[PDB]
Amino acid sequence: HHAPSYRVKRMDIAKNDEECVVNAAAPRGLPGHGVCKAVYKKWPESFKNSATPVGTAKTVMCGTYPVIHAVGPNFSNYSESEGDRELAAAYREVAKEVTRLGVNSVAIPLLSTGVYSGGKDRLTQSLNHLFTAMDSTDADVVIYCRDKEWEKKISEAIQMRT
Template sequence: MGIACTFERAEDGMPEIVVGAGRIRLVQGDIVQAKTDAIVNAANASLAGGGGVDGAIHRAAGPELYELTRPFGGCATGSAVITGAGRIPLPTRFIVHAVGPRYSTARDAECAALLRSAHEVSLRLCEEKAVESVAFPAISTGVYGFPIARAAPIALQAAMEHLKAGERSVKRVVFVLFTPADLQVFSEALASLGQG
């Protein structure tokens, strides 16, 4: 069953889709500069920081981010935890640390379910903190090897279904993609889902 939505282009030409009272927007850039209430970190299970998006967020948030994540003692794959934003400037107040799966073709269905779960749990945590806007990276598509063309519709569908559910604090979901090629893949997936 499709999700009723309207595919548009924002004033700056970036792809956007309206889902009920919410919007999903795609941009290319640095997630630390997203200017949303929360940003999602593509975290590892130890929550201790790493490379890619995880490293960039930890550097921007400062050493206090380690102190904020340490009490959790880690996070299971397919889940997430939420902390304060450390030194990342307002309006960002929270960082959601989502742990996506390491991709394996032999475990494709399991990996897809875990990736979807990481997005769903992240959105639920945002609801608990009355977050109105959240920015996601392309979770698991870097060193974890999840093919971006497979990951994009999973991530977008999770966001669309969350927004479609109705009375939610989250009204704006932004996917911040690192490269023009990543943006193109997500744009094509968004257009395809918008037609469903």
């Protein structure tokens, strides 16, 4: 009867201590910048047939270590309304994969808040879709970020639900 938790760490998600990692991926499975750059360097064999549509997630093992490639929408291409819908869906597919895998913990970034943000601050939008998807899972969730201001805000949001 463990107590599932949420935690935030400001560090490279490729150095995570969890049983699986979520990549903020691209639909064509191509190595990119940001999270996907780190994931490619650490777990390159997980990019075999990782391409998957926007709003979906696809898991590929690197050894026995699962890499969940989740494809958030690029807000430069989507309307705010359609993009918000795809971002919610991507996180829902992450939650299903985490559950299917049976892991006790997952390392997860904030999808569509960097290269795919359309130039907007989407910290709150993306974190809330994360919570909406993962709340009903019983995995320990650890959110990885790089920005000191964002660590604080993510940590505040976690605190004020406990």
